[PDB]
Design a protein around this ligand. Sequence first.
Ligand SMILES: [Mg+2]
Ligand SMILES: [Mg+2]
Ligand SMILES: [Mg+2]
Ligand SMILES: [Mg+2]
Ligand SMILES: [Mg+2]
Ligand SMILES: [Mg+2]
Ligand SMILES: [Mg+2]
Ligand SMILES: [Mg+2]
Ligand SMILES: [Mg+2]
Ligand SMILES: [Mg+2]
Ligand SMILES: [Mg+2]
Ligand SMILES: [Mg+2]
Ligand SMILES: [Mg+2]
Ligand SMILES: [Mg+2]
Ligand SMILES: [Mg+2]
Ligand SMILES: [Mg+2]
Ligand SMILES: [Mg+2]
Ligand SMILES: [Mg+2]
Ligand SMILES: [Mg+2]
Ligand SMILES: [Mg+2]
Ligand SMILES: [Mg+2]
Ligand SMILES: [Mg+2]
Ligand SMILES: [Mg+2]
Ligand SMILES: [Mg+2]
Ligand SMILES: [Mg+2]
Ligand SMILES: [Mg+2]
Ligand SMILES: [Mg+2]
Ligand SMILES: [Mg+2]
Ligand SMILES: [Mg+2]
Ligand SMILES: [Mg+2]
Ligand SMILES: [Mg+2]
Ligand SMILES: [Mg+2]
Ligand SMILES: [Mg+2]
Ligand SMILES: [Mg+2]
Ligand SMILES: [Mg+2]
Ligand SMILES: [Mg+2]
Ligand SMILES: [Mg+2]
Ligand SMILES: [Mg+2]
Ligand SMILES: [Mg+2]
Ligand SMILES: [Mg+2]
Ligand SMILES: [Mg+2]
Ligand SMILES: [Mg+2]
Ligand SMILES: [Mg+2]
Ligand SMILES: [Mg+2]
Ligand SMILES: [Mg+2]
Ligand SMILES: [Mg+2]
Ligand SMILES: [Mg+2]
Ligand SMILES: [Mg+2]
Ligand SMILES: [Mg+2]
Ligand SMILES: [Mg+2]
Ligand SMILES: [Mg+2]
Ligand SMILES: [Mg+2]
Lengths: 56, 209, 114, 122, 120, 7
Amino acid sequence: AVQQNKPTRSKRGMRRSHDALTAVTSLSVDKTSGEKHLRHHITADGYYRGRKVIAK
Amino acid sequence: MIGLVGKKVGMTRIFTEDGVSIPVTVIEVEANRVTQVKDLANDGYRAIQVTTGAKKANRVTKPEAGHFAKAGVEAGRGLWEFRLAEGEEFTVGQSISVELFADVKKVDVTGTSKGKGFAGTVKRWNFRTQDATHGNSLSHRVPGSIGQNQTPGKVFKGKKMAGQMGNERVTVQSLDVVRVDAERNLLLVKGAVPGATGSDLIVKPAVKA
Amino acid sequence: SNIIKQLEQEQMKQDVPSFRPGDTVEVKVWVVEGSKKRLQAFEGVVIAIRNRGLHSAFTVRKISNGEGVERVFQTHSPVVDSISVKRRGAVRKAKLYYLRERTGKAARIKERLN
Amino acid sequence: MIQEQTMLNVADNSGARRVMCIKVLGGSHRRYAGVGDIIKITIKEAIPRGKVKKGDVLKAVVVRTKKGVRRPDGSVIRFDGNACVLLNNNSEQPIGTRIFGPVTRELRSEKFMKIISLAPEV
Amino acid sequence: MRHRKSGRQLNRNSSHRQAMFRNMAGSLVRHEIIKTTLPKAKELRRVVEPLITLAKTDSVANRRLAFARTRDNEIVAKLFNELGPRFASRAGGYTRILKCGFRAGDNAPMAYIELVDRSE
Amino acid sequence: XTXPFXX
RNA sequence: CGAUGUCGGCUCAUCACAUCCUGGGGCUGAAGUAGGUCCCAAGGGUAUGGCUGUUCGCCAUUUAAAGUGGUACGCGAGCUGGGUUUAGAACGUCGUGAGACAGUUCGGUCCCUAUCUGCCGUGGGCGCUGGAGAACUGAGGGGGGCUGCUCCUAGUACGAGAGGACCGGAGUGGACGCAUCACUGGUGUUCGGGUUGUCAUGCCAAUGGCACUGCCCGGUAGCUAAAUGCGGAAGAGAUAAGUGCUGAAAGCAUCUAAGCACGAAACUUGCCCCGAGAUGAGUUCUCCCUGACCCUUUAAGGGUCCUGAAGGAACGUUGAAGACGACGACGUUGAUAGGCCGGGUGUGUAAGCGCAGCGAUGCGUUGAGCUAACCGGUACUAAUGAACCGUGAGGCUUAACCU
RNA sequence: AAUUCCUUGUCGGGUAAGUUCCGACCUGCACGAAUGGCGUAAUGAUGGCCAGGCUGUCUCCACCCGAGACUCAGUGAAAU
RNA sequence: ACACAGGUGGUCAGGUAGAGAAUACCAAGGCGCUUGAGAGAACUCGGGUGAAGGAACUAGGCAAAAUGGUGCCGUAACUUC
RNA sequence: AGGACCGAACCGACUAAUGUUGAAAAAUUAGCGGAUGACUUGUGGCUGGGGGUGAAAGGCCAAUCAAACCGGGAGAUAGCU
Ligand SMILES: [Mg+2]
Ligand SMILES: [Mg+2]
Ligand SMILES: [Mg+2]
Ligand SMILES: [Mg+2]
Ligand SMILES: [Mg+2]
Ligand SMILES: [Mg+2]
Ligand SMILES: [Mg+2]
Ligand SMILES: [Mg+2]
Ligand SMILES: [Mg+2]
Ligand SMILES: [Mg+2]
Ligand SMILES: [Mg+2]
Ligand SMILES: [Mg+2]
Ligand SMILES: [Mg+2]
Ligand SMILES: [Mg+2]
Ligand SMILES: [Mg+2]
Ligand SMILES: [Mg+2]
Ligand SMILES: [Mg+2]
Ligand SMILES: [Mg+2]
Ligand SMILES: [Mg+2]
Ligand SMILES: [Mg+2]
Ligand SMILES: [Mg+2]
Ligand SMILES: [Mg+2]
Ligand SMILES: [Mg+2]
Ligand SMILES: [Mg+2]
Ligand SMILES: [Mg+2]
Ligand SMILES: [Mg+2]
Ligand SMILES: [Mg+2]
Ligand SMILES: [Mg+2]
Ligand SMILES: [Mg+2]
Ligand SMILES: [Mg+2]
Ligand SMILES: [Mg+2]
Ligand SMILES: [Mg+2]
Ligand SMILES: [Mg+2]
Ligand SMILES: [Mg+2]
Ligand SMILES: [Mg+2]
Ligand SMILES: [Mg+2]
Ligand SMILES: [Mg+2]
Ligand SMILES: [Mg+2]
Ligand SMILES: [Mg+2]
Ligand SMILES: [Mg+2]
Ligand SMILES: [Mg+2]
Ligand SMILES: [Mg+2]
Ligand SMILES: [Mg+2]
Ligand SMILES: [Mg+2]
Ligand SMILES: [Mg+2]
Ligand SMILES: [Mg+2]
Ligand SMILES: [Mg+2]
Ligand SMILES: [Mg+2]
Ligand SMILES: [Mg+2]
Ligand SMILES: [Mg+2]
Ligand SMILES: [Mg+2]
Ligand SMILES: [Mg+2]
């Protein structure tokens, strides 16, 4: 099954009406190191909720 | 008359003196509490609205809490209405126990049927299956043809097709009330009722004779 | 479920004697013979026990006039007046479904005795 | 749970030995006979000087099945094989005169009282 | 269709799962902390904790069993000798997960899973 | 050329 | 004719009614039972097999009935490919022959990832005039609508007798539909056990890997039908054919012209589901927001500063919710998930040790050991205050109250 | 009848029922003797027919283990 | 045409089990096949199990299921023996 | 002894499903026939286009064949589109 007419550029546009990404708004900052990090995730230097977890 | 809101506990059985096993659904019916009356003057129809159970205060909202507060009953897991019937009369804050049913004899029991997800034609509509064998190519559970030819030249609305099945409102009519025990918040009705254990049920006295 | 336990065990028998698959039991069952209620005996080998509280049940197999008759009792039905152990059987297996494929002589199971 | 093509043993001195069910009477599209229902059979095997010969086509009540019978309390009576008792077409009612093997009380059925009155067990 | 079913299938067949988690409970135990996808990490807790639990009672049976699962004596040595008596008095939750972002090469949700004291 | 398309 | 593929089958259907069954009715050469014929009626229902490619037909056996038609002789981007069916081959028949048959026979490639319409599901957006959370009313829409048999009445009415009812009531079935997992069962590659071959963990003992889960015996939770519960209705309204009352036109007669009584599974209701995007955007209850400044073509104007509630949503733990979204639960003032404790359940007496035996193996400790998704508990682990979105009292007109 | 139009010929057998099968008849539309006639043990991925076992072929479908389908990331077509 | 599930002659032949160069498991040796991560819908593909029934399927038992070894005993018509 | 039997290699290609913008311009999987013979295979040679070769299908002669491919006559001719 293939199209009988070439869809319109407008239609392409409408089909993509919903693929905008959503930026996060959910970063937080570790109280004890001040690195940004997703909520509920650890930081790059391995801090989580202030205590230094991990250590690598 | 009015009906109560309960919870589906599970099924078991009551063995009877003369060796019958009655299969029963065990429905919890905590006191229903009237959260609002409605009348002609104010609403254009008479009915009680009721709550039951309890709700984590943190998860009660400002609006909800307002509305509850007014009737002076504590929050409950939800609200449900029952159409009053010329004669029936209640007052805000009134408490209704399962003993409402200490007779009736049969009840209609509404719940939300277990959710099967995206059902295909066979399961959802009892569509009878094509050959497993004898040449059939990729077409065993598939739904067959869905129309005629140019005439319609379309598919008719209401066509039995595959889609969500389950997880919708279902009433089951005229089940024998088996037991009513308010001290224990029990309603035993004979037979299985809609919805998985745990979910809400609406028991109204059966409408059919 | 805590309620349902309450409902179920207040309906359970507190005297079901002991028996295990292999044992030969005689179940005495109430029945209406025409115009008469009356106890009636069913005796055979316990080939299976379904252990579930009020819903507990057992399948008793017996060879009546030439072929098998299995009947699954519901241990707590009033219909079941009494259960009795005529002979303690020695097997190892919870479900004795294989005795079906055995006739007369192969069917026999060692006595437990102990 | 007998249906078309199902083979059954005979439970009487009718002379029939193996009958095949060619019809489940009692309802349009009705698919199974059991408990104590009335099927229509042909005869695939009969003894040499019986009251029915092979090839004969009449009816028969079913009196024993592997699927068995439930009871008001939940329990089940199962049988190792499927058995019926021949009846004659324009009368139902049993051709044989003796009955073999156990039968179940479901046969209380007025017209099958004979069958219970004969017949060893239950 | 899943209703009330436990157990993640990790796009694997039964044996393979079993293999892998055997190979991974051992890892976690040895190193006391490892990094893995968040899904696996969460399953791992189901395999690895009851080994610990088992180990809180030293007997021959229990070691052999802990060898049946795991099949590595170094590891069944550590449970029992170190780990069991470490968690002697704590009722489960021997393990802990720390979500830690996203795998470059495929964007898989990663996490650390660790014994609750490490020190190592 | 051999009956149905295209046997 | 720069391609509109086909008989039958399978699957799925949808209309017509010249109606097969069920319902109502007139006549009958209708005693009853059972028929015949016509009128009304399309709500629902309306067979499996033997043979043949068949449709059909015949035959067997059911059934209340096995309706007749339309829909590209409905339905091949849905399947099938037996019929038809190119190329191989053969018989008969024709032809000197190549060959041919609208004769027969054996064999013989069925592609297409769905843009649009349509359809089934499920979301995102905005709107409904300040914003919000709920519970609703119910315009509209959809579903459903079948029927056997037995018993009573009554062996009565009727009938010479055989036989055998109407009206009404009571049961219990067939087929169909929905729900459910309590029971009976299926499955249960996540539970337990037995066992073959081989490799390994040094060996023994004990285990593990691989061989379809190696092959098997069982089986929890869940899912599920064959399992067990419930349904079709009664009632009401207006009618069809039809039966009539009163009654003229037409001194009589006349169901009709005025007026009045009845009358069916059809219709409108009553039952179940959806349902205010019902833009004609409805009702009710509750909740939240009470700063100023500048500019322009000065108007429902544009901007800035401060503000940022109700609520939404986010993140995490998740669910008998689920393709994804969505919906529901829970986030320490906590049982949401995992673990952990106890119980249950399943399997069916582990290991080790001891005793017996030459040994295989038995017995004791022992209904042992192990035991998933189960029940009852338990903060051990993970569910961090926060962020974002949404604002800051809400147009004009008239009316009614009101100062 | 690989041959028979009429034709599912007729009769018999098998089946509850058999336009096929087998045995028969002869009215051979339109068999026939190396364009070989009729038989024929064995052989056959050869055509037709019956039966035992066997079974999810089917009544009528359920559950389960896996690869796709679905979701996230990377790459990235097609016919029209 | 491709780092293509195709095609391509000869030589070598370990252990256990086995008749075997079949087959299963191994040794030496060589590999996990150049997108992965999750989900656990329909439907498709490829497998396992299935109550009662048992060819009722269908043009047709198509496809499945079933049979399956060794040694003894023992095997009908018919036959060119 | 045997164009002998069963069965791997090897040769083949009866059934089905898959695939059908394939992993593949004919295959994959499960089943299947031959398998000391008119067997099967490597290397090289010979036969050439109205010609070859053919246990005969109009088969095969470089993804083709009721007359190969290449270049030429050549802008064959086309009352057709
Ligand atoms: Mg669900
Ligand atoms: Mg079918
Ligand atoms: Mg195909
Ligand atoms: Mg297929
Ligand atoms: Mg769970
Ligand atoms: Mg994947
Ligand atoms: Mg065109
Ligand atoms: Mg076209
Ligand atoms: Mg009409
Ligand atoms: Mg006429
Ligand atoms: Mg057509
Ligand atoms: Mg096609
Ligand atoms: Mg043909
Ligand atoms: Mg498609
Ligand atoms: Mg189960
Ligand atoms: Mg050993
Ligand atoms: Mg291995
Ligand atoms: Mg394996
Ligand atoms: Mg008059
Ligand atoms: Mg509603
Ligand atoms: Mg436990
Ligand atoms: Mg719990
Ligand atoms: Mg302001
Ligand atoms: Mg003949
Ligand atoms: Mg037949
Ligand atoms: Mg000739
Ligand atoms: Mg001559
Ligand atoms: Mg010849
Ligand atoms: Mg040959
Ligand atoms: Mg799957
Ligand atoms: Mg992608
Ligand atoms: Mg590669
Ligand atoms: Mg290659
Ligand atoms: Mg090999
Ligand atoms: Mg890899
Ligand atoms: Mg199987
Ligand atoms: Mg079965
Ligand atoms: Mg069986
Ligand atoms: Mg059989
Ligand atoms: Mg048929
Ligand atoms: Mg047939
Ligand atoms: Mg086959
Ligand atoms: Mg097979
Ligand atoms: Mg040979
Ligand atoms: Mg092959
Ligand atoms: Mg061979
Ligand atoms: Mg050569
Ligand atoms: Mg070629
Ligand atoms: Mg030429
Ligand atoms: Mg040329
Ligand atoms: Mg020239
Ligand atoms: Mg030219």
